[PDB]
Homo-oligomer: 123 residues x 3
Amino acid sequence: PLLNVHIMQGHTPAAKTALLKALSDAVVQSIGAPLASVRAILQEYAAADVIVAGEVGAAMALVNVDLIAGRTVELKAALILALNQAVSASLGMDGKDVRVVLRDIPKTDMGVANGLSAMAAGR
Amino acid sequence: PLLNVHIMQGHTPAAKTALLKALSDAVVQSIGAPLASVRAILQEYAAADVIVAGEVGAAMALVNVDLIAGRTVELKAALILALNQAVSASLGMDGKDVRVVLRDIPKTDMGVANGLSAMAAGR
Amino acid sequence: PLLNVHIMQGHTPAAKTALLKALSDAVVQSIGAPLASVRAILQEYAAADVIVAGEVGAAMALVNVDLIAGRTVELKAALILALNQAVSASLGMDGKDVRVVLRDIPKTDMGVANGLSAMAAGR
C-alpha cells in the first residue's frame, strides 16, 4: 500500500519518524502486506491552511491509502482502525481528529517496480 | 468529504482563508453534507512546479475530493460547479484554470472518527 | 489526466523541468490524451519525511494519475511504463524506486473547465 500522510505543523522530527514507522508496521500487522510493498510519505500543514467542520485552524490528521483491490471488508476495517490508532498514539492526538481513506486500486491500475503493473507482476 | 486543495503560491492570507471557508460552504450547500464531515487542507505550488497542457509554469488550481459513494450525478454536478466557483471567486482566477476531481469512496473504505468505517458508523 | 508527482528534495531545477515535460509527453504518447487535458504538479519531500519498506529516508518517487475511466488494460500498462521511465530518466533514478498509481474517474466525477463535469462537456 502507498500512504500519503497529512499532519499539523508542530510535531518533532523524532515524533514524525516514529509516526512513519508506526504507520508502516500498522499496515503489515493489520492486512499482512509484504513489508516491501509498504511506503509512506508525510506532509505538514500550518493551522491557517486547514479547516475542519467550518473551523479554520482546527487540528486534523489524514492518512490516504492507495492499495491493491481485493481486500475483504474485514481487513479494510482492520487497516483503517490500525492506522487511526497509529496516528493517535504516535502524535498524542485524539482519534476523533484523525481520518483514514482507502482507495481500492485494481491490479491493472497499480504500478510496482520498474513500471510494471501489479497484475503484470503477478500480485 | 475530505478536500485537498492545490493552488499557486502568491495569494494573500485573507484570500486563502476565504477559499477554505468558501470550499467548506460549497460542500455543505451543494450536497447537504453534515458540517462535521467536511475537511479541507491547502497546499501551495511554485510556478516552476506545475505544467499545464505542455506549458511549464501555467497557473492552475486543483480541488481533490474524497467523498462517500452514492451521491447522484445531479448532486456531483452541483458540487463540482460550487467548488469551481469557490476557487474562482476566492482567488480571482478564471474557472477555466481550475479543476475539480471527485473520488467516490465506498462506505467500507472511508474512515470516520476513531477509525471506524462510515459503514460501521451507520452512515 | 491530472498528475500529482512526489519526489525527493535536492534535484536540479533543470531536472524538475525535464521531469514535468517528460511526464506530460509520456501521457500524450502512451494513451493519446489531448495535450490540453494533461496537467502535472510537483511536490518535494525531505528524507526524514519518507519511509519505504520500513526504511526511513529511502529515496522514492510517486506519480499519482487521476484520469477519466475507459482506458484499456493495454493503454494503462503503456502509461504506467512510460511514466515510470519518464521519472527514472529525468531524475537519474532507479526505476525500482518509482511507483505510479492510476485512479479511474467516471466522466460524471471529473470536473473540467468552469466547473462542469466531463460528461456535461462530453469527454
